[PDB]
Amino acid sequence: AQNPNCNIMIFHPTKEEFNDFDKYIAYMESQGAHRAGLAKIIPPKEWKARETYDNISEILIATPLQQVASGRAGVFTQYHKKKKAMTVGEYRHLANSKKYQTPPHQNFEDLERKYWKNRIYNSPIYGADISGSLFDENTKQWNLGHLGTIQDLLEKECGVVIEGVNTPYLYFGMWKTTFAWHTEDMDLYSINYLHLGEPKTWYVVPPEHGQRLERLARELFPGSSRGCGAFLRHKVALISPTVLKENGIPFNRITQEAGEFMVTFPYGYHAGFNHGFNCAEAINFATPRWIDYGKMASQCSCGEARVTFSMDAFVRILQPERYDLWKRGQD
Ligand SMILES: O=C(O)CNC(=O)C(=O)O
Ligand SMILES: [Mg+2]
Ligand code: NI
Ligand SMILES: [Zn+2]
């Protein structure tokens, strides 16, 4: 078995190997990459996502989210308070302000220490989940707006044609902006490109050990667990590396820098934080190997998780027994 310790693997494809996206994902899996839940892909030196980022300031962040924490430094939840619209140029200026900017630090490890010590005492503002793309249309390789769609994959594998679409999302971050512990909708893959700016630190639990994280989460967030049998679908709970190590939960960490891709694998729980002003693009995708994960994915039916239009068909076809209850939670 390849990668039996479930380490995060880093790949350096050549420009030739960068042509065929599906083939490269299958290659990484042949080497055991998926066992970690997360892999890094450093693009060939010849590749670029677009020519420059000089003209992005007029993108609108219609609903910036202030991430307000509750709990203790290593075990907390966050809620999202909606803020007034602002442009990316306005948000960048805010991120760089004395109130929100990255503090002085020695290295990534020092900054990680400061994040876990101090995150709860601040409320950073995240421009998340913005439909759109920063890839130039002429970028042919690993262009996250030109991927094969999940609907087409389900149709190829299973023969059933379904409604729905699959488009990317932009994320504008600042120091301390946080993504809570989650797997993807329907335990899909994700791919995330850091277009510009400061790094993003990731934590990940191997898929084979995801239920260990779920059991800890039920212990640590006991009211939330009574409220919903899949409350990590709400995407609000944080648990620090120190707490994970105290509780024997297997995990790994890595920092993504500008110009790098990350892939999350089916049922790979992940969480993390941004170092400073940045912009990422991410989208979900599927492969043949996903289908069995999609069939077994948990679902929130309490009403909190509320997701896209396109998830309806996935539930309906892959999980017909759950459909009725899950759809009630959507309506
Ligand atoms: O970058 C973020 O805030 C969150 N991204 C992801 O969870 C992802 O790409 O799967
Ligand atoms: Mg612009
Ligand atoms: Ni994710
Ligand atoms: Zn729920």
Curated annotation (Swiss-Prot):
Keyword Amino-acid biosynthesis: no
Reaction catalyzed: N(6),N(6),N(6)-trimethyl-L-lysyl(9)-[histone H3] + 2 2-oxoglutarate + 2 O2 = N(6)-methyl-L-lysyl(9)-[histone H3] + 2 formaldehyde + 2 succinate + 2 CO2
Note accompanying the cofactor annotation: Binds 1 Fe(2+) ion per subunit.
Modification note: Ubiquitinated via 'Lys-63'-linked ubiquitin chains. Deubiquitinated by USP14 with the help of TRIM14 leading to stabilization.
Amino-acid positions noted as binding Fe cation in the UniProt annotation, renumbered to this chain: H182, E184, H270
Residues annotated as binding Zn(2+): C228, H234, C300, C302
Domain JmjN: 8-50
Domain of life: Eukaryota
Domain JmjC: 136-302
GO biological process annotation, one example: regulation of gene expression
Cofactor(s) named in the record: Fe(2+)
GO MF annotations, alphabetized: chromatin DNA binding; damaged DNA binding; histone demethylase activity; histone H3K9 demethylase activity; histone H3K9me2/H3K9me3 demethylase activity; metal ion binding
UniProt GO cellular component terms: blood microparticle; chromatin; nucleoplasm; nucleus; pericentric heterochromatin; site of double-strand break
Enzyme Commission code: 1.14.11.66
Residues involved in 2-oxoglutarate binding: Y126, N192, K200, K235
Residues with the PolyADP-ribosyl glutamic acid modification: E16, E17
Compartments, as annotated in UniProt: Nucleus
Function statement: Histone demethylase that specifically demethylates 'Lys-9' of histone H3, thereby playing a central role in histone code. Does not demethylate histone H3 'Lys-4', H3 'Lys-27', H3 'Lys-36' nor H4 'Lys-20'. Demethylates both di- and trimethylated H3 'Lys-9' residue, while it has no activity on monomethylated residues. Demethylation of Lys residue generates formaldehyde and succinate.
Homology family: Belongs to the JHDM3 histone demethylase family.
Protein name per Swiss-Prot or TrEMBL: Lysine-specific demethylase 4D
Organism this protein belongs to: Homo sapiens (Human)
Gene: KDM4D
Shown stretch of the complete protein: 11 to 341 of 523
